[PDB]
């Protein structure tokens, strides 16, 4: 059933045995039984084999052991019984084996240890007791063992350690007690453990720093974390000089002694986080083997200048969330690699601060108040790969010896507007720059976060030559025909009717829109091929604000004056005394256009979204601050006069419309309003586009029709008027008569 190794070794795995195997050679040396179904051990089960050395009973459910069953095994060395179903430590059947070496009792639900247990074992060296349900340390059975080396009691339910627990263990080397529920430690609990090297107390509920550790003279590695320790008194580590590793994290530490960490001749790393009230740098005299130093969350304001004159082998350095104001020189250091200084009050950089660090790779100085950086700062600094400096008021950024850089982030430095030289950064992989136009110099595989897409072009503002000539065309004739029509309507020395003065104001508003378009065309013509250079200055200056205000103002006056024109016509027909009434209404509407245009100016960043200074296209996120409001006002008005004119259609018949000159005026107004409706639908649709997730159009296209479909009325309204109202011809003859009389 079980194979024979030939060297006196017998192995049994999952062969369904409920009793001890028999018939094997009496000279076998090692016996393993695992995964079978033995539940009880009969008396004199192992009397057959007198030369057994190592004994494995793994995984089966043994529950009862006869006291005399284990007798006769005087040479047994290793005994393993884990994951079985014993409930108490077998004080009997164990006293016989004098020459036992290692004993493993894991995963067995054990609650009580008999007093006379572990008696007669004179040379036991390893004893494993974890994952059980122990509730108090077996002081007497432990004292019974004088030659124990390694002790593990983990995951048990111990609550407190009484005094003089481990007096008689002279040669104990390592002690593991983690995940227990210890909360109090006596001052003399650990006496006698002179040769203890490793001490583990993790995840316990310690509420105050223990003192008994000062009795240990040769404690190498010490680990406690996730506890509730909050205060580190000075002189704590005085007793034990040699400490390679100190584990502490997740503790809610508040105060740490000035001289606590002093005179540790062999400590390797030091980490302190969350210690808020500590405000003065620790005294590190005598510690000359510190690879890594980390202090976070404190109130430190200054740094000693002998720091790495002492620390000759420091490799990394991080100091963030402090109140550091000035930086002492780091010239002495040679092995320093990574430096992090964030959320501090640094405001200037000097040449000498970073001089002499040969092997510095990663440098971070983010979220500070630095505004002055010397040109020669970074000049003789060695090969540096990743440099991050952002969210600081910075005016000019030098570049000397940065050719080896790979990662460079500068975002939030709105004061920085100078372009970036492409030749210097030869091996740059990832950029972050505050304004998208700067990346146009690289024209990128370089990665620049800012989108620098169509809405923010590099070479031409208007893009296509056809679009350029088209806007040039409507600009011109809008201007010329608007001037002609206003001269015809106003220069005549005749009484001015309400409708005539109304169309005059229409002409004035359309003229304003036209020279807004003209100023845009002038900018495009001037900045041909090099828009990237001028973009930042143009958007930041007041010109963009002026242009946007002009456009917005021109577009509201036209709409409101048209609405007032068609109710003027409606009630004029109806009374067929409101002339002065409507004149000041027109004035009041002009004032409203003025204030509506100037309202966004007091806000921040509303007019700088696009180089065109028109907010209605918006962008990635215009987040409808007032765009939705404006389109709502425009649509509601249009539907109002749509209803008004439908009512007029119902009231007055078509034959009277054909035979009435006032109705010819009505037809002209109807043409005007219909044109205004269809030419304003597209911009409203574009503003509604981001609200719907399904619809998406390329910035190429939305820019083109936003450019084309905005100013058309300023062009066709005067053309419509002169082409289809002989009223203009009559005024033309009148002004010809006046000119002939003058000349």
């Amino acid at each position, epitope marked *: 059933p079980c194979s024979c190794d030939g060297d006196r070794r017998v192995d049994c795995s999952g062969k369904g045995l409920t009793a001890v195997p028999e018939g094997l050679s009496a000279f076998t040396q090692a016996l393993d039984i*695992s995964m079978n179904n033995i539940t009880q051990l009969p008396e004199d089960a192992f009397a057959n084999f007198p030369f057994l050395e190592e004994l494995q009973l793994a*995984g089966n459910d043994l529950s009862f052991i006869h006291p005399k069953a284990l007798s006769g095994l005087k040479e047994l060395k290793v005994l393993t019984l884990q994951n079985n179903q014993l409930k108490t430590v077998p004080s009997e059947a164990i006293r016989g084996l004098s020459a036992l070496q290692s004993l493993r009792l894991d995963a067995n639900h054990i609650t009580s240890v008999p007093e006379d247990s572990f008696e007669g074992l004179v040379q036991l060296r390893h004893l494993w007791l974890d994952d059980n349900s122990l509730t108090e340390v077996p002081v007497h059975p432990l004292s019974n063992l004088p030659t124990l080396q*390694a002790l593990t009691l983990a995951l048990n339910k111990i609550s407190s350690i009484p005094d003089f627990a481990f007096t008689n263990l002279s040669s104990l080397v*390592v002690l593991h007690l983690h995940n227990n529920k210890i909360r109090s430690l006596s001052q003399h609990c650990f006496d006698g453990l002179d040769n203890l090297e*490793t001490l583990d107390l993790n995840y316990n509920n310690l509420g105050e720093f223990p003192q008994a550790i000062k009795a240990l003279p040769s404690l190498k590695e010490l*680990g406690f974390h*996730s506890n509730s320790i909050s205060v580190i008194p000075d002189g704590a580590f005085d007793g034990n000089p040699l400490l390679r590793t100190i*584990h502490l994290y997740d503790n809610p530490l508040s105060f740490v002694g000035n001289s606590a960490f002093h005179n540790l001749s062999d400590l390797h790393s030091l980490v302190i986080r969350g210690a808020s009230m500590v405000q003065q740098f620790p005294n590190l005299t005598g510690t000359v083997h510190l690879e890594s130093l980390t202090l976070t969350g404190t109130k430190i304001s200054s740094i000693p200048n002998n720091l790495c004159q002492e620390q000759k082998m420091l490799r990394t350095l991080d100091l963030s969330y402090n109140n550091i104001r000035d930086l002492p020189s780091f010239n002495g250091c040679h092995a320093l690699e990574e430096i992090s200084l964030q959320r501090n009050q640094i405001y200037q950089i000097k040449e000498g601060t970073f001089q002499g660090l040969i092997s510095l790779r990663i440098l971070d100085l983010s979220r500070n108040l630095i505004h002055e950086i010397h040109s020669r700062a970074f000049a003789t600094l060695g090969p540096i790969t990743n440099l991050d400096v952002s969210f600081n008021e910075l005016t000019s950024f030098p570049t000397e010896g940065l050719n080896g850089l790979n990662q460079l982030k500068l975002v939030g430095n709105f004061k920085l507007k100078e372009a970036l030289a492409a030749k210097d950064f030869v091996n740059l992989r990832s950029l972050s720059v505050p304004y998208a136009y700067q990346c146009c110099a690289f024209a990128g595989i370089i990665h620049c976060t800012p989108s620098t897409g169509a809405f923010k072009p590099c070479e031409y503002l208007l893009g296509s030559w056809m679009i350029r000539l088209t806007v040039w065309f409507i600009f011109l004739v809008a201007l010329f025909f608007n001037l002609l029509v206003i001269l015809t309507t106003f220069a005549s020395c005749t009484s001015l009717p309400s409708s005539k003065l109304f169309i005059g104001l229409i002409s004035v508003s359309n003229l304003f829109m036209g020279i807004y378009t003209g100023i845009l065309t002038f900018l495009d013509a001037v900045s041909w091929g090099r828009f990237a250079e001028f973009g930042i200055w143009w958007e930041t200056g007041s010109g963009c604000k002026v242009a946007g205000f002009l456009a917005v103002f021109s577009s509201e006056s036209a709409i409101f004056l048209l609405m007032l024109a068609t109710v003027e016509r409606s009630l004029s027909a109806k009374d067929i005394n409101h002339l002065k009434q409507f004149r000041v209404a027109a004035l009041l509407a002009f004032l409203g256009a003025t204030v509506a245009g100037c309202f966004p100016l007091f806000h921040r960043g509303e007019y700088s979204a696009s180089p065109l200074c028109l907010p209605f296209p918006g962008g990635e996120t215009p987040s409808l601050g007032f765009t939705v409001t404006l389109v709502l006002l425009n649509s509601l008005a249009f539907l109002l006069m749509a209803v008004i004119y439908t009512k007029l259609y119902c009231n007055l018949e078509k034959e009277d419309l054909s035979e009435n000159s006032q109705s010819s005026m009505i037809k002209h107004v109807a043409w005007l309003i219909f044109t205004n409706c269809i030419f304003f639908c597209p911009v409203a649709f574009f503003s509604f586009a981001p609200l719907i997730t399904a619809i998406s159009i390329s910035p190429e296209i939305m820019k083109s029709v936003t450019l084309i479909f905005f100013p058309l009325p300023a062009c066709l309204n005067p053309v419509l008027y002169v082409f289809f109202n002989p009223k203009f011809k009559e005024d033309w003859k009148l002004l010809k008569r006046r000119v002939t009389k003058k000349s």
Partner: nanobody
Amino acid sequence: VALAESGGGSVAAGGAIRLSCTASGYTYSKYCMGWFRQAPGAERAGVSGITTSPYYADSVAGRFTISRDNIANTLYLQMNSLAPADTAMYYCAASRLSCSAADFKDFRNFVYWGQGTQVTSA
């Protein structure tokens, strides 16, 4: 004390592989073990580890299983659907103190190291 590993070799992409490590001794803490990956020209990195919620690396998430059997004191790591970037040398590391997940991205804490194996994926 002594650590030994078995497994490894050359496998076409998308295969499955099992790596088994055995340990002998008593000083090590059975609640801190890890598998470490090394590619030439770079320092060791921690692929996976057992802590007391196993710690898994960013990259190998969803394709790597780590298990421990204290019945026979063996550590198992099974991989499936490998990518060629997984071709490297593998180590088993055991500590002397209990450890958390935060201790696994720094190898210097671990002390007991194995001889290692080599696995290549095509």
